[PDB]
Design an enzyme around this catalytic site. Structure first.
Site, PDB file in Angstrom:
ATOM      1  N   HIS A 312       0.807  -1.205   0.000  1.00  0.00           N
ATOM      2  CA  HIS A 312       0.000   0.000   0.000  1.00  0.00           C
ATOM      3  C   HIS A 312       0.842   1.258   0.000  1.00  0.00           C
ATOM      4  CE1 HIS A 312      -3.609  -2.404   1.238  1.00  0.00           C
ATOM      5  NE2 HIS A 312      -2.636  -3.186   1.674  1.00  0.00           N
ATOM      6  N   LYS A 492     -11.255  11.591   7.801  1.00  0.00           N
ATOM      7  CA  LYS A 492      -9.964  10.943   7.628  1.00  0.00           C
ATOM      8  C   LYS A 492      -9.132  11.140   8.898  1.00  0.00           C
ATOM      9  CE  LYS A 492      -9.588  10.992   2.615  1.00  0.00           C
ATOM     10  NZ  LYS A 492      -9.523   9.483   2.548  1.00  0.00           N
ATOM     11  N   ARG A 493      -8.072  10.340   9.030  1.00  0.00           N
ATOM     12  CA  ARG A 493      -7.149  10.485  10.152  1.00  0.00           C
ATOM     13  C   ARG A 493      -6.423  11.817  10.066  1.00  0.00           C
ATOM     14  NH1 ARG A 493      -3.250   7.779   7.022  1.00  0.00           N
ATOM     15  NH2 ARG A 493      -1.121   8.680   7.199  1.00  0.00           N
ATOM     16  N   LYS A 498      -3.164  15.356   4.894  1.00  0.00           N
ATOM     17  CA  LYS A 498      -4.609  15.247   4.699  1.00  0.00           C
ATOM     18  C   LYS A 498      -5.306  16.616   4.717  1.00  0.00           C
ATOM     19  CE  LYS A 498      -5.071  10.467   5.896  1.00  0.00           C
ATOM     20  NZ  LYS A 498      -4.749  10.081   4.499  1.00  0.00           N
ATOM     21  N   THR A 599     -10.631   4.606  -0.193  1.00  0.00           N
ATOM     22  CA  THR A 599     -11.929   3.976  -0.257  1.00  0.00           C
ATOM     23  C   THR A 599     -13.038   4.911   0.240  1.00  0.00           C
ATOM     24  OG1 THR A 599     -11.542   2.984   1.910  1.00  0.00           O
ATOM     25  CG2 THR A 599     -11.002   1.688  -0.019  1.00  0.00           C
ATOM     26  N   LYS A 603     -16.789   5.460  -1.234  1.00  0.00           N
ATOM     27  CA  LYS A 603     -18.055   5.343  -0.518  1.00  0.00           C
ATOM     28  C   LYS A 603     -18.958   6.565  -0.811  1.00  0.00           C
ATOM     29  CE  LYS A 603     -15.558   2.845   3.182  1.00  0.00           C
ATOM     30  NZ  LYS A 603     -14.805   3.113   4.454  1.00  0.00           N
TER      31      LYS A 603
END
Length: 753
Positions: A312, A492-493, A498, A599, A603
């Protein structure tokens, strides 16, 4: 009325007179009884999916859905005067995962069961997850994330294995969870290994605990604190423990089915979810050579023909490494084997870049995985090509045949059939029930792209889902959501790249525009969700800001009618299941070179949400599948960021001084209003970081981001044009079915069926 008659049997009472708690328990048993009598899948070659996390989520509802019993139950409860949602809130979400890695595992094993693949996951039964997130004084604190009740989905077994370490041997215990397939008669197990004699008393204040008490702490926490040697060692104990149990298991299960160990490859294949289960390779070899008397070099041939590796990570530098010294402290016997593999490889390949052990005695677990496996797959088309062309090229040059792509996927049961039942029924209404077997038949929704009757319905479903969320947030998160607002969600984390802090800077803008008297056409609700690493100080400063903001924003009569900001506490699967189907704007604004997939993106696309984001990651495939008009891409190219990192000529201070939008937003962080609400240290620190450093370039896209958002907001005001793009998104979301993704894994790699 199958479940009603069941409760009468086992209780002697009617649904009307039971509590939500007692009813949950009765459902629990009801379902565990249905599953117990289901046979396994029987494909000769069993697949083993090893992962250090399984972010599996609550199981009650999904199990019911997969049993086909969810509607009849929901009906019987309502007819008894009982809300299923309140029964669902009884269950505690299994704390067995953290990020996208775990969720991918769940979605994958789900599709396995639904497609009838004899393929089981193997991981650890973490009694506390990463950590439970609690807000106190506008800051994130951590607490154990306990979840296991006496009555749970954990099905005990009598299986135990000895796992040998330098200073002791551990006895394992095995609990299984039934992983059900959609309307299937056969089931799979999720195999979660653990130990007895776990001591919760070590946990003291917060998540703090003695990292050296292995026998008492092994499976307490996922990704335990890593800032010190002792912590690191514990990670090794964990990884090997999981791995040794896994290998012992598959060998036993092979033998039961008439396997001599020479032909193990015909009975078992292993897919390792990242570098955490890398030690399965030399472990399998050990077992075969020493425990089962197979020639070492034959053992190697056998193992390397039944191993699959999934990477990943983007950059090769970030791949997992272990100092030899540390490994000898914990698994010295394995180390010996790993040094043997080094010998084999170092003798055959002259490129020093592909070596398992490097000059500084570090062990590159990934490098091992590549040499002794049949498949090395990337997660997304561009990501895989990055591996082949730069980051992992040295290995590509000698193992061209092993490198392949497997685009990530999500399970349509959990993220559609359950998450958005309303929408699920509507789809069937329009284009039939075919999309269950083939998600690409969602393209039939295109024919209704211009149909006004539909645009009206989608907006209605959207609105109902907002109501479903409003109920939830009020009930479990102490939050008053306004259903009559535009909902903008970033879940998100927390990491600088981010760029939740970018979205927070936009909030400060919009707040300042309202205070100027320039008011929105429609009310906006920005919602955040996710955890931050306790050690990551800047991420926690960011979280602190947004908490100060939502307090400032939501308590100002002048602004409240126009802007709401929320950070939902302790973000997780069951919170996502509520947020996503109710979301208008999907925030996917990470920096341009830092995302491989996503992902979450996939969604939102499925649940009728338009995406606002950077040209990177899953966004790339999305923007391709829909039109440029059916998505709101902004910010710099991936190439431009990489190059700018390369030149090292980015100075965030220039963006700050030169652009008024930015200058003003940033200065507000340390303004009198915000300082009063929060801590001077945190806010002042974060404030100087953005000016003086800002390593992940929050300021670079800010001015364009804000602009792109305002445009997107204004485009909301026309509900025929808006939901036209929504139909464009949902009609193309079939591409991200996890069933397609697994079919590809199985066709190209596993060959299980």
């Amino acid at each position: 009325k199958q479940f009603s008659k069941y409760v009468q049997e086992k209780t002697g009472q009617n649904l009307e007179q039971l509590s939500n708690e007692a009813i949950y328990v009765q459902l629990l048993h009801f379902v565990k009884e249905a599953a117990k009598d289901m046979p396994k899948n029987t494909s000769k070659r069993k697949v083993y999916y090893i992962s250090a996390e399984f972010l599996i989520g609550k199981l009650l509802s999904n199990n019911l859905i997969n049993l086909g019993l969810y509607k009849t139950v929901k009906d019987e409860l309502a007819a008894a005067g009982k809300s299923i949602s309140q029964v669902e809130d009884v269950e505690l979400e299994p704390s067995l995962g953290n990020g996208g890695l775990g969720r991918l595992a769940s979605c994958f094993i789900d599709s396995m069961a639904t497609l009838g693949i004899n393929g089981e996951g193997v991981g650890l039964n973490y009694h506390c997850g990463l950590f439970k997130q609690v807000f106190r004084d506008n800051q994130q604190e951590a607490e154990p994330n306990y979840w296991i009740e006496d009555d749970s989905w954990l099905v005990p077994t009598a299986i135990s294995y000895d796992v040998p370490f330098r200073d002791f041997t551990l006895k394992s215990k095995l609990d299984r969870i039934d992983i059900l397939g959609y309307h299937k008669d056969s089931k799979n197990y999720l195999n979660l290994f653990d130990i007895d004699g776990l001591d919760y008393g070590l946990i003291k204040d917060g998540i703090t605990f003695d990292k050296t008490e292995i026998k008492k702490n092994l499976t307490l926490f996922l990704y335990p604190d890593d800032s010190d040697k002792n912590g690191e060692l514990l990670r090794i104990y964990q990884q090997y423990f999981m791995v040794s149990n896994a290998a012992q298991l598959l060998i036993d299960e092979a033998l039961e089915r008439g396997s001599n160990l020479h032909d193990l490859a015909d009975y078992a294949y292993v897919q390792i979810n990242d570098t955490h289960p890398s030690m399965v390779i030399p472990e399998l070899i050990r077992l075969l050579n020493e425990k089962h008397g197979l020639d070492f070099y034959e053992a190697v041939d056998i193992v390397k023909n039944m191993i699959g590796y999934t990477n990943h990570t983007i950059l090769a530098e970030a791949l997992e490494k272990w100092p030899l010294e540390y490994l000898n402290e914990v698994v010295p016997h394995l180390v010996t084997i790993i040094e043997h593999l080094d010998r084999i490889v170092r003798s055959q390949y002259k490129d020093d870049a592909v070596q398992i052990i490097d000059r500084d005695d570090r062990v590159h677990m990934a490098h091992m995985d590549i040499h002794f496996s049949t498949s090395v797959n990337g997660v997304a088309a561009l990501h895989t090509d990055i591996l082949k062309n730069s980051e992992l090229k040295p290995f590509y040059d000698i193992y061209p045949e092993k490198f392949n792509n497997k685009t990530n996927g999500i399970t349509f049961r959990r993220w559609l059939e359950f998450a958005n039942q309303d929408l699920a029924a509507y789809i069937k209404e329009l284009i039939g029930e075919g999309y269950l077997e083939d998600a690409t038949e969602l393209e039939k929704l295109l024919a209704f792209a211009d149909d006004k009757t539909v645009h009206e319905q989608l907006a209605k479903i959207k609105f109902n889902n907002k109501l479903a969320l409003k109920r939830y947030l009020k009930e479990n998160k102490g939050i008053n959501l306004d259903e009559n607002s535009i909902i903008d969600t970033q879940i998100k984390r927390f990491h600088e790249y981010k760029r939740q802090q970018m979205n927070a800077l936009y909030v400060i803008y919009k707040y300042l525009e309202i205070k100027k008297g320039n008011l929105p056409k429609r009310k906006i609700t920005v919602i955040f969700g996710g955890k931050a690493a306790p050690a990551y100080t800047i991420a926690q400063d960011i979280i602190h800001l947004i908490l100060c903001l939502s307090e400032l924003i939501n308590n100002d009569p002048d602004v409240s009618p126009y802007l709401n900001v929320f950070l939902v506490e302790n973000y997780n699967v069951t919170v996502a299941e509520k947020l996503i189907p109710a979301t208008d704007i999907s925030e996917q604004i990470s920096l341009a070179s830092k995302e491989a997939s996503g992902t979450g993106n996939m969604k939102f696309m499925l649940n009728g949400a338009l995406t606002l984001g950077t040209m990177d990651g899953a966004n790339v495939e999305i923007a391709e599948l829909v039109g440029s008009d059916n998505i709101y891409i902004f910010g710099k190219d991936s190439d431009t960021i990489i190059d700018l990192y390369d030149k090292g000529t980015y100075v965030s201070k220039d963006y700050y001084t030169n652009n008024a939008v930015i200058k003003e937003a940033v200065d507000f962080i340390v303004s009198k209003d915000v300082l009063a609400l929060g801590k001077k240290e945190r806010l002042e620190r974060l404030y100087h970081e953005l000016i003086n450093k800002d390593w992940f370039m929050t300021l670079i896209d800010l001015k364009e981001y804000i602009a792109k958002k305002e445009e997107m907001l204004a485009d909301y005001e026309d509900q025929n044009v808006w939901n036209k793009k929504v139909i464009q998104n949902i009609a193309k979301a079939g591409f991200f079915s996890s069933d397609r993704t697994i079919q590809q894994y199985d066709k190209d790699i596993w060959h299980s069926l």
